[PDB]
Design a protein around this ligand. Structure first.
Ligand SMILES: CCCOc1cc2c(cc1-c1cc(/C=C/C(=O)O)ccc1O)C(C)(C)CCC2(C)C
Ligand SMILES: CCCOc1cc2c(cc1-c1cc(/C=C/C(=O)O)ccc1O)C(C)(C)CCC2(C)C
Lengths: 10, 211, 211, 10
């Protein structure tokens, strides 16, 4: 789930 | 603590037809991550749990928002892209029945009770903090946050609408309609994917992958 | 008026594995009609509307009852036929995931809060009086009955469990889990019918016909 | 829906 992980990371 | 002021602030800070509908959904997925981070205590949860909650709730969260947005729209919805989609256009695109469910079970009910933005925000935060979500490392923590949201919403309803003692219950009882409609829209999306004619963008595609 | 005493009286008055599960469901459909007639004001509604409500709610109504019945059962459910079905038997019959959903989202939650029979009865009456049901001749009348049920339940919770101010909300918030699980069990039944190996009795068959 | 109608009838 790369997109979500990246956006939640900041 | 879970003040309704922060929840309201979160809502305000993010403020054929099937194709246009899927565009809007994808578009709003980026916005949803931003909303969730502004909901008290969500960002402090383990990253894996934040992922589980957003993957479990995204559809219901997005449906709630466009339904409330559509309260001034006669027999239609307003997409986040600025497009108004009318009932007639939904029917003639083969998705009439589900469209009408949204109108009668969500948009119209929100309109008839004048559901406000604090109330919408709380219901969404409740949906977000879903302790039934599979794979959570601490369901008890998520449950605790859900309880705080609905304690605050109840206090907010007793205070702002004291002449409506059933309002809090009325709000919560839209959640089974939302669940059901969320599951039906997801079914449709999987079918659009299967047939392969409808463009489905990357964030929407990622939500459609297995856990 | 909607006294919880009458609702409680209604509950008390009606007091491979897939095959055995389908037998129980059919069996309980006859019992459900009897229960509904004992719920205040239901029998006074138009016959066509009584038909709509029972066709819309039967599955959720039946799932709620067997879940509460299963509260003393470790990792299993008790069928109305007297059969205990264990988790292991569900998994090895290809229906493990949905079985676990019932255990964790319904049975276990009812157990951890010690949901009583008056509370179960009220939640079921709320499910019964569903004003979103399609084809109703007067949704407003059904809504009014739903509101009366949840006014009485709230008063009952404030009085019997005064130390648990969140109990009423907690009860209502099992309804989205129930909706979702009802829809999944129905999906499975349609599949059992399609494959054609599982015996499905007449009342169960009739529920599976189009409106 | 014959069975349900019959049972609701009494
Ligand atoms: C998730 C991609 C499809 O989502 C849909 C599908 C539908 C519909 C709505 C959505 C949908 C739309 C949106 C749009 C949000 C927005 O514009 O803010 C988010 C999530 C969704 O599931 C309605 C009920 C309008 C009409 C029927 C269909 C099945 C076409
Ligand atoms: C409606 C016929 C099948 O209903 C099911 C199916 C299941 C299950 C339960 C039911 C069911 C059972 C019953 C039984 C009630 C009772 O014994 O009092 C009523 C309604 C139902 O949908 C569980 C969750 C136990 C296991 C998974 C499956 C999908 C096999």
């Amino acid at each position: 789930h790369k997109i979500l992980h990246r956006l939640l990371q900041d | 603590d879970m003040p309704v002021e922060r929840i309201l602030e979160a809502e305000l800070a993010v403020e054929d037809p099937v194709t246009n509908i899927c565009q809007a959904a994808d578009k709003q997925l980026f916005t949803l991550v931003e909303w969730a981070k502004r909901i008290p205590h969500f960002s402090e949860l383990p990253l894996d749990d934040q992922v589980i909650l957003l993957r479990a709730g995204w559809n219901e969260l997005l449906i709630a928002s466009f339904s409330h947005r559509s309260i001034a729209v006669k027999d239609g919805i307003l997409l986040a892209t600025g497009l108004h989609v009318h009932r007639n256009s939904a029917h003639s695109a083969g998705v009439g029945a589900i469209f009408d469910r949204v109108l009668t079970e969500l948009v119209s009910k929100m309109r008839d009770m004048q559901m406000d933005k604090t109330e919408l925000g709380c219901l969404r935060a409740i949906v977000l903090f879903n302790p039934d979500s599979k794979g959570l490392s601490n369901p008890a923590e998520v449950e605790a946050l859900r309880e705080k949201v609905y304690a605050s919403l109840e206090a907010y309803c007793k205070h702002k609408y004291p002449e409506q003692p059933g309002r809090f219950a009325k709000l919560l009882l839209r959640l089974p309609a939302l669940r059901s409609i969320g599951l039906k829209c997801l079914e449709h999306l999987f079918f659009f994917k299967l047939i392969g004619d409808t463009p489905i963008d990357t964030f929407l595609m990622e939500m459609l992958e297995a856990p």
